[PDB]
Short mmCIF file of C-alpha atoms in Angstrom, two decimals:
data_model
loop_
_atom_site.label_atom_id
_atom_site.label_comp_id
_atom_site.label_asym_id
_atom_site.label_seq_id
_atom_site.Cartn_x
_atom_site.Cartn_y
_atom_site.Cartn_z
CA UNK A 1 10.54 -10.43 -27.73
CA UNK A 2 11.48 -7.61 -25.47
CA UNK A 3 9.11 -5.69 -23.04
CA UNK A 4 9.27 -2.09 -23.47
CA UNK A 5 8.89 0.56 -20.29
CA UNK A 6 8.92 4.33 -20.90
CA UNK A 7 10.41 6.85 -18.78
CA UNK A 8 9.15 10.41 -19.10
CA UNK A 9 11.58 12.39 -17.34
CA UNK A 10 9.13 15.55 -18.02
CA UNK A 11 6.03 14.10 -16.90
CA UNK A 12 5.37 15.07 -13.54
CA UNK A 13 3.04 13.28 -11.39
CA UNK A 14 3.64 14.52 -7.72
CA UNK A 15 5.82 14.75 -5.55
CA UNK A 16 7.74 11.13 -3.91
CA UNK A 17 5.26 10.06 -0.63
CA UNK A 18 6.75 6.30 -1.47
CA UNK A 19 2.51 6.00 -0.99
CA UNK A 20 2.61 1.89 -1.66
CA UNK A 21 5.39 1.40 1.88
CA UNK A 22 3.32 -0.30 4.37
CA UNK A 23 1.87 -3.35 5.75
CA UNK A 24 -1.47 -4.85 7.41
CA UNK A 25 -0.17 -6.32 10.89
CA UNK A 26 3.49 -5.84 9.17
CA UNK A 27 4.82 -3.46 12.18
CA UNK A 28 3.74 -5.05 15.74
CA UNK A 29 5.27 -4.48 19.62
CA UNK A 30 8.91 -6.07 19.25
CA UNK A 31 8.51 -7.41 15.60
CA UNK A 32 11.01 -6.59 14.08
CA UNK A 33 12.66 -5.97 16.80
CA UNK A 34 15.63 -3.80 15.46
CA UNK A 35 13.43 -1.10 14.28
CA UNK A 36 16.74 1.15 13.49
CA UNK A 37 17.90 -1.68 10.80
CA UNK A 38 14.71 -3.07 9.21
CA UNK A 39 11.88 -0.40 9.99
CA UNK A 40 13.92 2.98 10.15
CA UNK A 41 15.25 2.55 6.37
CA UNK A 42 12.36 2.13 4.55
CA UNK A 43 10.88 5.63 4.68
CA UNK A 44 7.56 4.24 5.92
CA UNK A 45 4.18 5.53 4.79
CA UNK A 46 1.37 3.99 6.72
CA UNK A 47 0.98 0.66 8.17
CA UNK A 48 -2.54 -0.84 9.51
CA UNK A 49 -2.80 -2.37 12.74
CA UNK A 50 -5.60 -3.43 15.02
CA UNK A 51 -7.14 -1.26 17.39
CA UNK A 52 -6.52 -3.97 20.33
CA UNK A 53 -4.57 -7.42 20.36
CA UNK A 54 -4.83 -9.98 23.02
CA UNK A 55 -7.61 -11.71 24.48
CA UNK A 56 -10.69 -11.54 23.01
CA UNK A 57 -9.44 -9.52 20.22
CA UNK A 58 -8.67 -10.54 16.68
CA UNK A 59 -5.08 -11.37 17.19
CA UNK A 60 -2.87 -11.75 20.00
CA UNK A 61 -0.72 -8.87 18.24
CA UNK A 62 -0.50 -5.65 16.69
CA UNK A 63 -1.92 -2.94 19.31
CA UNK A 64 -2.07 -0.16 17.21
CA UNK A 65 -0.95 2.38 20.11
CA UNK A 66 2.06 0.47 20.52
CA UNK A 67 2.51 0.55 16.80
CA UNK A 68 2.22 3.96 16.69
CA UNK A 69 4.40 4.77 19.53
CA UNK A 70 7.31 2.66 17.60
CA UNK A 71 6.85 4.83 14.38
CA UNK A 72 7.32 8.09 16.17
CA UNK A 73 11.11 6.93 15.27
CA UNK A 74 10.06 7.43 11.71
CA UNK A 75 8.30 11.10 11.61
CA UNK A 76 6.43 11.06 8.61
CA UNK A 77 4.98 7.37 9.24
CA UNK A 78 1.51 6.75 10.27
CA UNK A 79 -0.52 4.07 11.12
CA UNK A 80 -3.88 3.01 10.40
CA UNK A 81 -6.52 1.70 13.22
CA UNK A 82 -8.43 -0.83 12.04
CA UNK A 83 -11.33 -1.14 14.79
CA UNK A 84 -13.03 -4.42 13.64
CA UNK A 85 -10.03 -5.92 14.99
CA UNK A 86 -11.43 -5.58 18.10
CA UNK A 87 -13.36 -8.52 17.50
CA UNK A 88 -12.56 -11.87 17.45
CA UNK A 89 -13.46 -14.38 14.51
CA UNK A 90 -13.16 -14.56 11.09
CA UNK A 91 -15.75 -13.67 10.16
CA UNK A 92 -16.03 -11.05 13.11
CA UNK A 93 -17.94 -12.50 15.72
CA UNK A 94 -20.81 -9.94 16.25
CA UNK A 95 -21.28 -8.64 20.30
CA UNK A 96 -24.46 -6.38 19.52
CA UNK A 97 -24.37 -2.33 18.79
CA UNK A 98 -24.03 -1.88 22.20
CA UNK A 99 -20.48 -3.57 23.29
CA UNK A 100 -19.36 -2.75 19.95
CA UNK A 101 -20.00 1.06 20.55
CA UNK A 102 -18.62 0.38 24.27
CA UNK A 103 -15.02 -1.37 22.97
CA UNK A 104 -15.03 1.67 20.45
CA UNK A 105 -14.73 4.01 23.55
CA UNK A 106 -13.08 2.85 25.38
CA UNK A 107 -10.05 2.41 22.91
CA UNK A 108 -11.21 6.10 21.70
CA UNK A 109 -10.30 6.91 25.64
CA UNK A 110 -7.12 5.76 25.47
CA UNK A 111 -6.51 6.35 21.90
CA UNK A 112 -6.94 10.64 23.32
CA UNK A 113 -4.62 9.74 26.94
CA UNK A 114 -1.50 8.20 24.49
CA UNK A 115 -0.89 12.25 23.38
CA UNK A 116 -0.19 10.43 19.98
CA UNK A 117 -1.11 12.02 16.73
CA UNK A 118 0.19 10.00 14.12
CA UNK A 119 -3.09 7.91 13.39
CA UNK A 120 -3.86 7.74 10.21
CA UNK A 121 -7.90 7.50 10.50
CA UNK A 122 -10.68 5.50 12.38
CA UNK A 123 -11.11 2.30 9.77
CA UNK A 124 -14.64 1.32 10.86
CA UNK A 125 -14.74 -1.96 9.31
CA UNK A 126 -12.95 -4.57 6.83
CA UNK A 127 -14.04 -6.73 4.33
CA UNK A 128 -17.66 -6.35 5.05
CA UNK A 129 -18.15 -8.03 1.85
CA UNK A 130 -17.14 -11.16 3.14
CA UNK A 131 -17.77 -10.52 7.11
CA UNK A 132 -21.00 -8.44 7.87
CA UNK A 133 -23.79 -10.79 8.57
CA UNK A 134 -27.70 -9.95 8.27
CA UNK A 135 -27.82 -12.31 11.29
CA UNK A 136 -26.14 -9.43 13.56
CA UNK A 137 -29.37 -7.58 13.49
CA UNK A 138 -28.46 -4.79 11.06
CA UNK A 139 -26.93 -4.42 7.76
CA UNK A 140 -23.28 -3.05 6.94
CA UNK A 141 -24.88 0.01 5.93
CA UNK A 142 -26.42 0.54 9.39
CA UNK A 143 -23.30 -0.30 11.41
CA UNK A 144 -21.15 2.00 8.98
CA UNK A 145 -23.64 5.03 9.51
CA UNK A 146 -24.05 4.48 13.57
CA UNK A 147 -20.80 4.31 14.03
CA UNK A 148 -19.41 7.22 11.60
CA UNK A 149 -21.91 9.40 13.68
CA UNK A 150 -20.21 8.05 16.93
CA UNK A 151 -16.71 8.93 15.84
CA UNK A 152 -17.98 12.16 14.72
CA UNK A 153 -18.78 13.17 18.26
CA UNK A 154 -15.73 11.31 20.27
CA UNK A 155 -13.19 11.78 17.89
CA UNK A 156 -13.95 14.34 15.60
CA UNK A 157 -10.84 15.24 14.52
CA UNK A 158 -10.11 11.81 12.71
CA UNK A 159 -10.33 10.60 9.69
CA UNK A 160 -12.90 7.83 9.28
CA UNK A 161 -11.61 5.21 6.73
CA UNK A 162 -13.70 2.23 4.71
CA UNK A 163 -15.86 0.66 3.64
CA UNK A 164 -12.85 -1.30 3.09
CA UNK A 165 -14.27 -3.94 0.90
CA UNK A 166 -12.47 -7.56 -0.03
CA UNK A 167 -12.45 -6.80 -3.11
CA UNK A 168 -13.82 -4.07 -5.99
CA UNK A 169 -16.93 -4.08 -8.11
CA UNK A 170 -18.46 -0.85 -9.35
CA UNK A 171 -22.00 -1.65 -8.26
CA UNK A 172 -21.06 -2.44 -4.87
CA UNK A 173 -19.26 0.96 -4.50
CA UNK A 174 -21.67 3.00 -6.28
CA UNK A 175 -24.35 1.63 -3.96
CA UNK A 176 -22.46 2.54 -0.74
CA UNK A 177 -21.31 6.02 -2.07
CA UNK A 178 -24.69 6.91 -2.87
CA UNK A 179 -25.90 5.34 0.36
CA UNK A 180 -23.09 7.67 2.36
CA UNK A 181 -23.21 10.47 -0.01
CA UNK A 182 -27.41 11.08 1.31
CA UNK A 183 -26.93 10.03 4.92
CA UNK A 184 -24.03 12.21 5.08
CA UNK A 185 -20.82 8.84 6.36
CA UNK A 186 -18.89 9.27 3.35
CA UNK A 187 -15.37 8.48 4.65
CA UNK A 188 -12.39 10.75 4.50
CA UNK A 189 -10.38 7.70 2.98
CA UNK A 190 -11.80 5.55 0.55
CA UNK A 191 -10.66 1.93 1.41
CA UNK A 192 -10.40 -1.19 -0.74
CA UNK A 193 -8.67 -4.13 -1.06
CA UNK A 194 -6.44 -5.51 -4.13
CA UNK A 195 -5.34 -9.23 -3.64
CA UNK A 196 -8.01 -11.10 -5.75
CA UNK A 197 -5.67 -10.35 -9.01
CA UNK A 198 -3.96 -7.56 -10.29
CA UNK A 199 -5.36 -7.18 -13.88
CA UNK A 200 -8.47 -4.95 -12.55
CA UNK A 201 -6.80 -3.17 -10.25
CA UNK A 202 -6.24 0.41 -12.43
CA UNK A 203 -9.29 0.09 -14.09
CA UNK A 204 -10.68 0.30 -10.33
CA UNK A 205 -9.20 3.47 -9.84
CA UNK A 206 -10.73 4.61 -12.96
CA UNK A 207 -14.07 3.60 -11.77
CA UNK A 208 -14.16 5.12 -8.70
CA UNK A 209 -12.86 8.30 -9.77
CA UNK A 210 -15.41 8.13 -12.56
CA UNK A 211 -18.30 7.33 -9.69
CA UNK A 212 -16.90 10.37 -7.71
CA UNK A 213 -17.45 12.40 -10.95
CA UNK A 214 -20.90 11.08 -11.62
CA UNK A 215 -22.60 11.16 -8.16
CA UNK A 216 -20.81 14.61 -7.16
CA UNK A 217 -18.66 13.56 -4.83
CA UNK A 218 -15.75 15.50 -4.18
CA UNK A 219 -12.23 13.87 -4.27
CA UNK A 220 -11.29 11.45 -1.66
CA UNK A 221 -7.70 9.86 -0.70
CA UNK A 222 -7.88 6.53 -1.70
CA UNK A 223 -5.82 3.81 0.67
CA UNK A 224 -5.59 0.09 -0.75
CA UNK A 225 -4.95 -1.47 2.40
CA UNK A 226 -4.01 -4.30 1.43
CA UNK A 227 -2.72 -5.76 -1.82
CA UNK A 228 -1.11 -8.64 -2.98
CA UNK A 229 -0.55 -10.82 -5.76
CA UNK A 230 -3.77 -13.71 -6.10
CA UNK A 231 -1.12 -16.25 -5.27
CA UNK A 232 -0.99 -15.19 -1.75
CA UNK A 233 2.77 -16.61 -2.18
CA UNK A 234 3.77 -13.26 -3.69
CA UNK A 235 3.23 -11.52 -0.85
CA UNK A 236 6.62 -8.98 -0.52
CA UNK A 237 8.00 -10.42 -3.82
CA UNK A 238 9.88 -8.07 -5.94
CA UNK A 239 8.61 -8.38 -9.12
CA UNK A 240 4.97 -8.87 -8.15
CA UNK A 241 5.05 -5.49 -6.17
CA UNK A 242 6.44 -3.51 -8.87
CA UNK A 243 3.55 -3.80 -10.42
CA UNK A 244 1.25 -2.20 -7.62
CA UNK A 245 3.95 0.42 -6.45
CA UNK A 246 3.56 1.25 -10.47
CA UNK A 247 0.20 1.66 -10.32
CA UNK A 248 -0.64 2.84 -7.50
CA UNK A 249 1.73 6.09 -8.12
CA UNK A 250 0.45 6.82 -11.72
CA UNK A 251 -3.06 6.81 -10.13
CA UNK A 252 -1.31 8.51 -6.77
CA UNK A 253 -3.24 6.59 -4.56
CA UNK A 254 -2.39 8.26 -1.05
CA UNK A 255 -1.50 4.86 1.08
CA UNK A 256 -0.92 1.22 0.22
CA UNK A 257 -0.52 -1.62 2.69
CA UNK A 258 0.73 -4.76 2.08
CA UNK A 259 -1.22 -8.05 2.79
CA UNK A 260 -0.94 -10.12 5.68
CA UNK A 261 -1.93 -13.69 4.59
CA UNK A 262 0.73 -15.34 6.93
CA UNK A 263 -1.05 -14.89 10.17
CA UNK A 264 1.59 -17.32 11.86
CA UNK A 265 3.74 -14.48 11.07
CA UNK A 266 3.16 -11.11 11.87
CA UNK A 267 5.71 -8.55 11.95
CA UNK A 268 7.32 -9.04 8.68
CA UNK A 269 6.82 -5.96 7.28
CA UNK A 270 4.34 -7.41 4.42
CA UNK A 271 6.27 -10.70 3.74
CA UNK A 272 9.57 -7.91 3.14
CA UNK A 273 11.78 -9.86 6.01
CA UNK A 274 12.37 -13.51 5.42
CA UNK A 275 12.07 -14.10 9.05
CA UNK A 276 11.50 -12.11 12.03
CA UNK A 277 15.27 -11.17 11.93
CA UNK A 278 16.39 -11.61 8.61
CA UNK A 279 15.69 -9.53 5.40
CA UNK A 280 14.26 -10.94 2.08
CA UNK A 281 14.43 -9.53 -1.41
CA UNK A 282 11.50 -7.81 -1.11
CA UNK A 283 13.22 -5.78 2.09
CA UNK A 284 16.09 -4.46 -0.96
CA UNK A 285 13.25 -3.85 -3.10
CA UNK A 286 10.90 -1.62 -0.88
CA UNK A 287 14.29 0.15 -0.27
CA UNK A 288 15.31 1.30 -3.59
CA UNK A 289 11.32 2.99 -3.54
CA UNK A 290 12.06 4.25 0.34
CA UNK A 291 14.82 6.23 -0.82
CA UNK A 292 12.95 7.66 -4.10
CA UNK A 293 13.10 11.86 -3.63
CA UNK A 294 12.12 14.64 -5.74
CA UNK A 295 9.14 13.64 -8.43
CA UNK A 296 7.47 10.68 -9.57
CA UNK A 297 7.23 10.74 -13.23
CA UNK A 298 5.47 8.68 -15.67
CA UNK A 299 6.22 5.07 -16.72
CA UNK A 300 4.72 3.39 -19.82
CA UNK A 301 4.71 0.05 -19.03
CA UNK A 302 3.55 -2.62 -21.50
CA UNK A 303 0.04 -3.00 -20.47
CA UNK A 304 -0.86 -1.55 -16.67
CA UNK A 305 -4.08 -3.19 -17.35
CA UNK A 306 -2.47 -7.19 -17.03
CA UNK A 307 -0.13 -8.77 -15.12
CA UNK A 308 2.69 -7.52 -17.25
CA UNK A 309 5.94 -5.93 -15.92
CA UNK A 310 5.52 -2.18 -14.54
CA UNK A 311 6.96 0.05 -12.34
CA UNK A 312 8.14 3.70 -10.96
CA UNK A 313 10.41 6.53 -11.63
CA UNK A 314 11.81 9.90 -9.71
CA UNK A 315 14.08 12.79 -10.92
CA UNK A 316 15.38 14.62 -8.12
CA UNK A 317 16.95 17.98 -9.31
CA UNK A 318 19.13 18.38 -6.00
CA UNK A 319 20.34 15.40 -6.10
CA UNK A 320 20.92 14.96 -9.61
CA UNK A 321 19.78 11.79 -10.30
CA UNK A 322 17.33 9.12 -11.87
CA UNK A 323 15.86 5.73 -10.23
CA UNK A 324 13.14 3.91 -12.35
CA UNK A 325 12.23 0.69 -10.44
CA UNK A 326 10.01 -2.15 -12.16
CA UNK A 327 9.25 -5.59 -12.32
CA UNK A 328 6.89 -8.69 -13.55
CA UNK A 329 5.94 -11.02 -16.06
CA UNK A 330 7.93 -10.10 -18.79
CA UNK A 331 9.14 -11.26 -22.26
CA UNK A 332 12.79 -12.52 -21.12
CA UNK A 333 14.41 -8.90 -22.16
CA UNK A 334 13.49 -5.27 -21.47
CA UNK A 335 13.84 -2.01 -23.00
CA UNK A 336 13.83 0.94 -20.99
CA UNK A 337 13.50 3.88 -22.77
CA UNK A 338 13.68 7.31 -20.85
CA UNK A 339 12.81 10.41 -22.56
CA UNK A 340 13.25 14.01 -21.91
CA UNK A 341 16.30 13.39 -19.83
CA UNK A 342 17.42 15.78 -16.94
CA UNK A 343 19.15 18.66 -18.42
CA UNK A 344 21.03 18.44 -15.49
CA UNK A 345 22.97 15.18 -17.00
CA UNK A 346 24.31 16.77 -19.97
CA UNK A 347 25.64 14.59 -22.98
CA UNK A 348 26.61 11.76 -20.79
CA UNK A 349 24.51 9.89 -17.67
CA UNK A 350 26.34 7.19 -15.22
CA UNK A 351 23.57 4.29 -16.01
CA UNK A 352 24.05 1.35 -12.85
CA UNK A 353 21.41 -1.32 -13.45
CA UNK A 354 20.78 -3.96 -10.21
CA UNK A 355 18.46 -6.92 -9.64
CA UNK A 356 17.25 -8.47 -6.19
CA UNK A 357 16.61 -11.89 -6.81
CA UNK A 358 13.92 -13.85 -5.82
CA UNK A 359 13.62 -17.70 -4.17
CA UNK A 360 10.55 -17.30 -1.83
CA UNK A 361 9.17 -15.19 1.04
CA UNK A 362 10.87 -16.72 3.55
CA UNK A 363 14.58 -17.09 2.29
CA UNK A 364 17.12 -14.57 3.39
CA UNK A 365 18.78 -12.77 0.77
CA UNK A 366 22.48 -10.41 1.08
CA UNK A 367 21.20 -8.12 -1.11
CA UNK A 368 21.14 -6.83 -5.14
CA UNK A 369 23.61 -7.53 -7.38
CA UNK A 370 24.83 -4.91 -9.96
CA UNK A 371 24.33 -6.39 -13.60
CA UNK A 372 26.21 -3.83 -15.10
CA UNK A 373 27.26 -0.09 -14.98
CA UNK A 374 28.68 1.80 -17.65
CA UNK A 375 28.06 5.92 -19.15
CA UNK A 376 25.45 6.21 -21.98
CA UNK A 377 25.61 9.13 -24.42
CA UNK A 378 22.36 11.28 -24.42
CA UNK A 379 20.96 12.41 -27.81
CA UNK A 380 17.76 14.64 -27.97
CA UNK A 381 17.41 13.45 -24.09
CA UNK A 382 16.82 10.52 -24.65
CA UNK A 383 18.69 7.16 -24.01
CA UNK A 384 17.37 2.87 -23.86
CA UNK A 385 19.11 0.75 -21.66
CA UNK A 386 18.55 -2.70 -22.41
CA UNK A 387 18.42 -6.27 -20.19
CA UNK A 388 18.66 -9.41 -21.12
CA UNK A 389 17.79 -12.59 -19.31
CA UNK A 390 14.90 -11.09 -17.22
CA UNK A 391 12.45 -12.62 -15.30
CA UNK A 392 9.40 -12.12 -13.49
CA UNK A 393 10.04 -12.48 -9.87
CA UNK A 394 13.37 -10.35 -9.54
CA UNK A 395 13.00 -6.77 -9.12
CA UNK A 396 14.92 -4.11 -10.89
CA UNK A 397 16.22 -0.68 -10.71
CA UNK A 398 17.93 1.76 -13.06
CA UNK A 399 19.77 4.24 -11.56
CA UNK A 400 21.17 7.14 -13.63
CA UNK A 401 23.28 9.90 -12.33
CA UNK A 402 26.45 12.77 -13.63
CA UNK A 403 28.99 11.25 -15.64
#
């Protein structure tokens, strides 16, 4: 059977912002170390890093100032500070209201003397759905609104980002927008997680865009911060992150991290280099999207609402071409069918279709290979290109430029 994706050259979305490049803990202070060659290329969007590493903290990795200081190399990159990382534990090991509002200043403090600006918000919290604890004296509501009002007066300029929950559920949401919505801590970024299986994830969107709608709420950025596959395994795979890159840029989510379940680790750019030196195929993968300019247009996949094969598309008018990305569980061939080609081609479009292959997260891989590359005539705009022998863990680009 053969698993059909549609290209609609004429459907704009938005412009490229590559939204899905980043990674929770994936950027830390000399991992990777050659930022030019493994950082630098990817067109970076926002990572997420914790507001202090080291002792007593979290992790003994990932100070978010550093962070930020290494993306300046990459000007439109920006980092997210996630504060409950001050803590350590898992879950968070609760210090009281009053060292947790003292920790918050103090990195606030030097947060102001760094001169830095590319933050991307104040996270307050994460996964409070599986960390807050009655036990610490007040509930996650209570901590969320204390501490929005303290970032309000020491930072105000920020963006505060949450609640950050494990994982969606309409109920839970509702009851925290309404809660925020009347005491006046609704975040600037909405924050969730996606890595407890991919099926739900648009219909999330939908939902919260719906709640938004119903409660009279006006439109909020959304940032999944961090996603993965449910086998934790997929983390940086090719295939399984076409999906979400898919996804997230037909719902144009504004920021997407990657997971970090491999907390031996860090520094791997979301499972995208094999080692702490070495690319993987997810590396190639993430940058085919990097270099994505001009528009992101709309992809048909065969069901966004599954695990099924999806993916993402550009046009660029200037430079005259066409790169449509995907990957996934798939029927063993695919169609791709783009419509309402670029004038700009004419009768005849240069079609070069690649692969990055898959083994695991951790081995090194050289790079795509080119299946094949041949000119296609264009009738009425349109044109299919077909694989065979697909799979669901490579990933796969179509690239279409002059002939």
């Amino acid at each position: 059977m053969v698993s059909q994706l549609t290209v609609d050259c004429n459907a704009k979305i938005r412009r490229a912002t590559h939204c899905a490049s980043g990674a929770h803990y994936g950027l830390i202070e000399n991992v990777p170390k050659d930022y030019k060659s493994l950082v630098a290329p990817l067109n970076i969007n926002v990572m997420r890093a914790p507001a202090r590493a080291g002792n007593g903290r979290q992790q003994p990795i990932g100070d978010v100032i550093k962070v930020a200081q290494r993306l300046k190399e990459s000007p439109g990159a920006r980092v997210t500070i996630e504060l409950a990382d001050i803590l350590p534990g898992w879950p968070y090991r609760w210090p009281g209201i009053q060292t947790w509002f003292n920790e918050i200043r103090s990195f606030i403090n030097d947060k102001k003397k760094s001169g830095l600006t590319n933050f991307y918000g104040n996270e307050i919290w994460n996964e409070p759905d599986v960390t807050w604890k009655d036990s610490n004296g007040l509930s996650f509501n209570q901590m969320w609104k204390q501490t929005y009002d303290l970032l309000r007066q020491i930072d105000p300029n920020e963006k505060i980002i949450g609640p950050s929950f494990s994982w969606y559920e309409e109920n839970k949401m509702k009851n925290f927008l309404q809660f925020s919505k009347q005491n006046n801590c609704l975040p600037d970024i909405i924050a969730w997680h996606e890595l407890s299986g991919i099926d739900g994830v648009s219909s999330h969107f939908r939902s919260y865009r719906n709640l938004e709608k119903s409660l009279g709420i006006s439109e909020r950025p959304i940032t999944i911060n961090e996603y993965c596959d449910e086998n934790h395994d997929l983390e940086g795979q090719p295939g399984s992150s076409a999906r979400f890159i898919g996804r997230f840029e037909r719902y144009k989510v504004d920021s997407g991290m990657i997971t970090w379940w491999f907390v031996p680790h860090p520094g791997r750019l979301g499972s995208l280099l094999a080692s702490d030196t070495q690319k993987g195929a997810g590396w190639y993968f993430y940058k085919w999207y990097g270099d994505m300019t001009g528009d992101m247009v709309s992809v048909s996949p065969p069901n966004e609402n599954s695990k099924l094969i999806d993916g993402a598309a550009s046009v660029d008018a200037s430079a005259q071409y066409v790169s449509f990305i995907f990957g996934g569980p798939n029927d063993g061939s695919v169609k791709a069918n783009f419509k309402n080609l670029p004038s700009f081609l004419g009768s005849s479009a240069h079609v070069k279709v690649e692969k990055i292959d898959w083994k695991s997260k951790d081995t090194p891989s050289n790079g795509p290979n080119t299946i094949f590359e041949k000119n296609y005539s264009i009738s009425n705009g349109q044109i299919s290109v077909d694989l065979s022998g697909t799979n669901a863990s490579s990933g796969y680009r179509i690239y279409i430029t002059k002939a």
